[PDB]
Design a protein around this ligand. Structure first.
Ligand SMILES: Cc1c[nH]nc1CN1CCN(c2nc(-c3[nH]c(C)c4c3CCCC4=O)cs2)CC1
Length: 126
């Protein structure tokens, strides 16, 4: 079995920006979710080989994880906050697509997503 290449975290062809909203996404949103007791499954791309999930990347064609998001923020990969918010939402949605309601991993995603929503509700104006 094989994992796909991880999502890119650098691309010199892609225009970059640092905005106050992106700074908030790193210092408040990512930091809060990253330290949570349920963060660990989301801190790296899913290793479908080690986890014996040979169907994971048959079902999930837009993988995303907080380790990737963290690196994208640190490397100023994004142009705007909406790009980064979309990556978070992709991560949560993938979890709900692949797994079953009530699975431990879904309960963990739901706890992180509640906090995500609480923080982005106070995203500062640009
Ligand atoms: C040792 C350590 C401490 N902190 N971080 C680490 C390194 N990694 C350690 C392994 N790990 C892991 N993720 C998962 C994981 N994740 C998602 C989003 C999953 C799954 C399985 C089910 C379906 C699913 O949707 C399993 S094992 C991720 C992090």
């Amino acid at each position: 079995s094989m994992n796909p290449p991880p999502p890119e975290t650098s691309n010199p062809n892609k225009p970059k920006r640092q905005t106050n909203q992106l700074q908030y996404l790193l210092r408040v949103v990512l930091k809060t979710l990253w330290k949570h007791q349920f963060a660990w499954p989301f801190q790296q791309p899913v290793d479908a080989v080690k986890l014996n999930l040979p169907d994971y990347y048959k079902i999930i064609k837009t993988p995303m994880d907080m380790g990737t998001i963290k690196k994208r923020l640190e490397n100023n990969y994004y142009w705007n906050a909406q790009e980064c918010i979309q990556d978070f939402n992709t991560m949560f949605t993938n979890c709900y697509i692949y797994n079953k309601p009530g699975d431990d991993i879904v309960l963990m995603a739901e706890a992180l997503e509640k906090l995500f929503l609480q923080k982005i509700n106070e995203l500062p104006t640009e």
